[PDB]
Write a protein that binds this ligand. Sequence first.
Ligand SMILES: [Mg+2]
Ligand SMILES: [Mg+2]
Ligand SMILES: [Mg+2]
Ligand SMILES: [Mg+2]
Ligand SMILES: [Mg+2]
Ligand SMILES: [Mg+2]
Ligand SMILES: [Mg+2]
Ligand SMILES: [Mg+2]
Lengths: 326, 326, 326, 326
Amino acid sequence: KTVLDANLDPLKGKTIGVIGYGNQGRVQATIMRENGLNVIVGNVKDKYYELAKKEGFEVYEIDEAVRRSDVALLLIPDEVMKEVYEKKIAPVLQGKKEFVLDFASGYNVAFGLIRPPKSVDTIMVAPRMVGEGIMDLHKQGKGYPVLLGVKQDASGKAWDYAKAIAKGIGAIPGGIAVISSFEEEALLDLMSEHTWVPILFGAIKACYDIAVKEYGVSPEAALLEFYASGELAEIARLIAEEGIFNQMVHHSTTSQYGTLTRMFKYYDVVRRIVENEAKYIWDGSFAKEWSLEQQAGYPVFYRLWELATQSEMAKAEKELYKLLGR
Amino acid sequence: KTVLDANLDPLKGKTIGVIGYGNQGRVQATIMRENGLNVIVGNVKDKYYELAKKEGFEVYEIDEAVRRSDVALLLIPDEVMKEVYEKKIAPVLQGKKEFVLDFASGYNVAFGLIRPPKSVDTIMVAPRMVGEGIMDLHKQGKGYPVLLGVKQDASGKAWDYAKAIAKGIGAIPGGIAVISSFEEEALLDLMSEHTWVPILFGAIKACYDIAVKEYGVSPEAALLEFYASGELAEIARLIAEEGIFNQMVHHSTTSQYGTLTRMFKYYDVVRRIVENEAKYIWDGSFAKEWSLEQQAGYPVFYRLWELATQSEMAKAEKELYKLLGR
Amino acid sequence: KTVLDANLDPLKGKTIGVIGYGNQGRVQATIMRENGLNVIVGNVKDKYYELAKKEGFEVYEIDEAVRRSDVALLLIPDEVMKEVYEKKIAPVLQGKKEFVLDFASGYNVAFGLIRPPKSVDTIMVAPRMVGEGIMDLHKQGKGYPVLLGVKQDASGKAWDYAKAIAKGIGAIPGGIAVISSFEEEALLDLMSEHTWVPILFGAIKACYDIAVKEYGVSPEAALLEFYASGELAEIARLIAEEGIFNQMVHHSTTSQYGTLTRMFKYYDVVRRIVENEAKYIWDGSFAKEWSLEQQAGYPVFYRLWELATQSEMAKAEKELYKLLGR
Amino acid sequence: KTVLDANLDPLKGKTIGVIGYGNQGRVQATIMRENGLNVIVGNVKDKYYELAKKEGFEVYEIDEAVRRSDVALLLIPDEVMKEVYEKKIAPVLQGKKEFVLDFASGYNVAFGLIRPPKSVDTIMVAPRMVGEGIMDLHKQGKGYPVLLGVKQDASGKAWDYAKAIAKGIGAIPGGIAVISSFEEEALLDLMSEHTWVPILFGAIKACYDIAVKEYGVSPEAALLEFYASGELAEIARLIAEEGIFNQMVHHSTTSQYGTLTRMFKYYDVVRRIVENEAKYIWDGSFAKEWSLEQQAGYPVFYRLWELATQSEMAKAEKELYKLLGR
Ligand SMILES: [Mg+2]
Ligand SMILES: [Mg+2]
Ligand SMILES: [Mg+2]
Ligand SMILES: [Mg+2]
Ligand SMILES: [Mg+2]
Ligand SMILES: [Mg+2]
Ligand SMILES: [Mg+2]
Ligand SMILES: [Mg+2]
C-alpha cells in the first residue's frame, strides 16, 4: 500500500523555493538541483548563508524567496519555525493564487501552531534516515524511505505534488514512500523519544546504581559491560539487516533464554508506560507544556541537565574516557 | 430579597458610553436609547461598525467614546477584553474625577485580570436570557431577570447606578434583579459549563458507545432515540414553565419510576464531580490555565476539536442529517 | 440500510382495528382514515370514548373491535396492557386463522409479559416524535421517523405489513423507517430514561446543593443560572438542527474549552454508570422489579415523590415561579 | 411545644365509630364511653365480637358501623388493614360530605398503602404505653403520652379534632401530646425495632457463643448472668424513673467505668448501623419487602424462626426453665 514511482512534470518547469540551508538544506537542495529543478535558497544572513553561496546557489532573504517561489519547502528547525512563519511568510501568503507549502516536521502543523490559509495546499515529506547517509546513498544509487501526507488539499493536485517531490529529492526509486497523515508523523516522531529511549537510558542508569551501590562492583567495571565497550552498537547493527528477533540466532543459547523469558514477562509492565504516553501526545497535551517551557525560559530543561551531568554514572565515564584514549 | 423598581434620574441627564456593538450592542443599546438616554457606541472600524451606524447611532473609536462618556458600559467578549482595557481605557482612566464602569462578565474582574482604579466605581449587570429573546420581550412588554453586583464603591452611589441601569435596559419591571457579587456571577457562569453540560454530552456519547459496540443496535436507530429526534427539546420546554420535577406528571408511570430511583441513586456519585469542580474555579485555578492556553496558541483546544469531530457518533449524525433533509 | 417507501395494498381492503383512543389514538387514527383504511376504534366507555365518537369514528368495546378487526393496532399504555391483553384479547385470539397484531411499545413483549400465539404475527411500529408534532407535520407535509420490527413471522407477510402501516400512518415518505428488533426498541426507550436523564437532574440538583450550602450564592440566583432562565431550552434547540458538537460554534471560546476538556475527562467515569445500567435492563432485571412495585402498591414510588417535592431546590423554585408571573 | 388540654365539644354530640375490638378496642373504647361519647363498635363476627357485646356496647359489622359513624377510629392490626380498608370502607367513603378518619398506625398511611379521599380528613393518635397499663392509669387518675399528627386537612378542623380525641381517650390531662407527622411516627416505631432491639438480642447471643464455645463456661452458668436472672429487668426499671445515665449512680464504681469507656468507644461503630437503617426506612424500601414477604407466603419469616428456635442458646434455656420451676 506504498508508492514507488511517479511523475516529475508537476513540480517541473516552475521554481521551487527552499527555506533554510541547515541539516536538510545542505542535503536536500543539491539533489533537487540535480533533477533539473530551479531551486532558490532562502536564509537570513548568518554562517549558513555562506555555505549556500559557497556551493553554487542563488540565495536571498527568507521572506523574499517565497515571493519568487512556486513550490515552497520549509527546512528549518521546529522551535524557531512558528515565529518565522508568522513574521515572514504570513504577510506574503495573501498574494498567492495557487501555492503548495511543504513541511518536513509534523509537530508544528498537527497541533495547530501553524495554520496555513485555504489557497496554500500544505503537505509533508519526512525522510527516514540519519541525514548523514543520504549523500552516501545518493552516491551509491539507492534511495531512502519517506513519509508522505496531505493536510489541506484545496486544488486536487496534492498527490500530484506529494509524490513528485519524493521523486525529486531522490527518495524513490530505491526507497519507498508511505502515505500517511500529519498526525501520525507527529506521533511516531515523539512517542519514540518518549517511550523507548528514556526507558532505555533510565534502565542503564538503574543498572549502574544497583550494581555499584549494593553488589560492590567496581565503578570502572560496570561501565565496560553496559555501554563503554561496544555491545549496544553491536546489538544495533544486526537489527538493521536481519530483523529484531532474527539477530538473536547469533547469540549464545543462554542469552536467548533469559531475554525471551523476560521480554514476555515485562511486556505488560511496559505497555502501561507506553499507552499512557501515547494518549498524552494525542491530546495535544505535550505540545502545550513544551510551548510553556520556552516562554518560562527553560528552568526545568536547565536543572535536568545539571542533574544529569553531575550523576555518578556521568562522572565515572569522564575519567574512563581519559583512560581509553577517547 | 430582590429589587423590582428604582429611579432612573441617576444615570439620566449624563451621556452613557457603550463599548462594542456585538451580541449585546445590537440588543442593549436600542433599549437604552428608548429610555431617554444619550448613548454613544464605541467600536473600532470593522463589520460591526456598520450596523451601529446603519441603525441610527453616533459612533466613534473605542478609547474615544470613554472620553465623552460619563457612565461606561463594556459589552465586548471576554477573551479580547483584557488587552483592550489595558491599551485603550487604561491610558484615559487617569483623567476621570467621578466614573462608573460596568461589565456584563464577572470572569475578567473577579479573578483580577482587570483591576480598575479607585475613582472608577466598577459594577455588574448580567442578563439572564438568550439575548435573542430580549427584543421579543421588549416587543411583548415584560422584562428579564438580571444579576447586579458591586465590586468597588468609592462614592456611595453604586446602587443608585446599579439599579438605574437595570431600569434603563428594560430588565425591571417585568423581570427581577438579584443583588449578588462579582465572584458569584463568575462561579455560576462557569460551573454550569463545567459540571452538568459536559457530563450530559459525555453521557449521550457513552450511551452510543455502549449500545452500538456491544448490544448490536443499528447506528441510525441509536441517534433517533438519543438526540436526533426531539425529546431533549421536549424535556427542556416543560421545565421553563412548570418546574424540574413538576413536568414529570406529563410522563408515563414507568418513566417516573426509573428516573426517580436512579436520580437519588447516582446523586452521591455526581456530587463529588461537582464539589471538586467548584473548588477548582473558586481557587482561580481555571482562570490560570485558560490564560495559558491562549498564550500557547490553543494546542489542546485544537486537538480536542478533531477528536470530537471525528468521533463515530459525530460521523454517524452527518449521514443522518443528509437523510432527514437537514 | 433504511426503508423509504412501500406498498399500501397489503393492509388495504381489510378493516384495521384500533385499540384505545389515548395519546396515539387521537393522533394515529385520523391519519389512517385519511389513507383510505377502514379503522374501528376500540375503547371501553370512559372520557376517551367520547372524543372518538365526537370526531367521527365508529367505536365499540375493546374485546369486540378485535373480533371485527383484520389488522390489530394496540395503542394503550404499558402498565395496563398486560391484564387487558389477558382478559379481553386472550379469549378471542383462538378464532383467528390469519392475524397480525401491532404494539407501539416493546417493553411488554420483549420481556415476555405478553406472549401471542403462533397464528398471530406480532410486529412493532414505534414513532420517534413528541406526538404533539405529528399533526403539525401531517399539516406541513413531511413525515417522522419510526422503528419497525418483527417478533413472530408465521406467514412470511410480516414486512409486507410492517412497512405498509408505516406508509399508512404517514411516517414515510418524508421520514425514514429503521428495521430493528423488539429487544432493541425496549432497550433504547429505557436506557435513555435510566442513564442520561437521571444523571442530568441529579447534576442540576447537586450544583444547587454545592453552591448554596457552601459558596454562599443566593437561592434565587442559583436557579436563574441553572434552569429557571432558558439556556437548557436554548442548548437543546440547536442540537435538533445542527448537531451535538456543531452547535458549539455558536458559543464563546471559553465555553467550548471548559466543555471539551471535561467531556473527555469524565467520559470514563460516566461510561461505568451506563454500562452497568445497560446490562441491568438486558437481563430482564428491571422488568421484574417494576412488576413488583406495582404489586406492592408503589411504596417506593410514593416516598421518592415526597423526597423530591420537598427538596430545597424544589421548594425554592416554587416562590420563584410566583415571582416571574409563572 | 406540646399541648396539654383542649375542648371536647368538637367530637361531642356526634357518634364516633370504633373499628375492631382488639388490643386497643378493649382499652380505648371504654374510656371514650366514659367521657360522654356515643361509640359504636365495628367488628366482624369472631371471638372479639363477643367481648364487645359482653361488656355493654352496641356492635355491628365493620363496613356498617362507618355508615352510622361521624368520627372514625380504626383500631385494627397493620397487616390486615390494607385489604379491609379497600373492601369495606372504600365503597362507602364516597357518601361522606364531611368525615374524619383516625389511624393509630402510621405505617399503612405514610408509605401510601392507604390513600383516603379529599373529603375524609385523616389524622393520627398514637399511644405511648404498654396498653396493659392504660386502665391502671385510668384507675389511678393520670394520663399517658400520645403522638398527634395530621396528614390531610380539607376542612381546617383537624386540630379541633386531633386534640379532642386525645382529650377523649384520657391521654391528657395527666400525660402530654406531641404534635408530629405521619412520617415521623412510622419512623420511630420501625427504627426502634430495627436498630437497638436486634442489636441487643444479637449481642446477648454473641456473648453466649463466645463464652461457651471458647472460654469453657458452663452452659447453665452463662444464661444466669446474661438474662435468666433479672438484671435486664433491673437495668430497665430504673431508666423509667431516673434517666438513662442517672441510674448508673446506683452501681459499683467499676461498672460505671467499663460502661462509659466503651459506650463512647463503640458509638462510631453503632452509628453506621443506625444511619444506614434509617435511610432504608425513609426511602420506603422496607415497606416494599415486607409487602413482598406477605405475598410470597413468608418463606424467610418461617425459616428464621426455625433457625432461632433451634439455636443452642434457645435450646439451653429450655432445660433451665424446667429447673427454676418456670
Ligand atoms: Mg525520528
Ligand atoms: Mg553473551
Ligand atoms: Mg450562562
Ligand atoms: Mg416514554
Ligand atoms: Mg422515548
Ligand atoms: Mg457563555
Ligand atoms: Mg413501639
Ligand atoms: Mg456489678
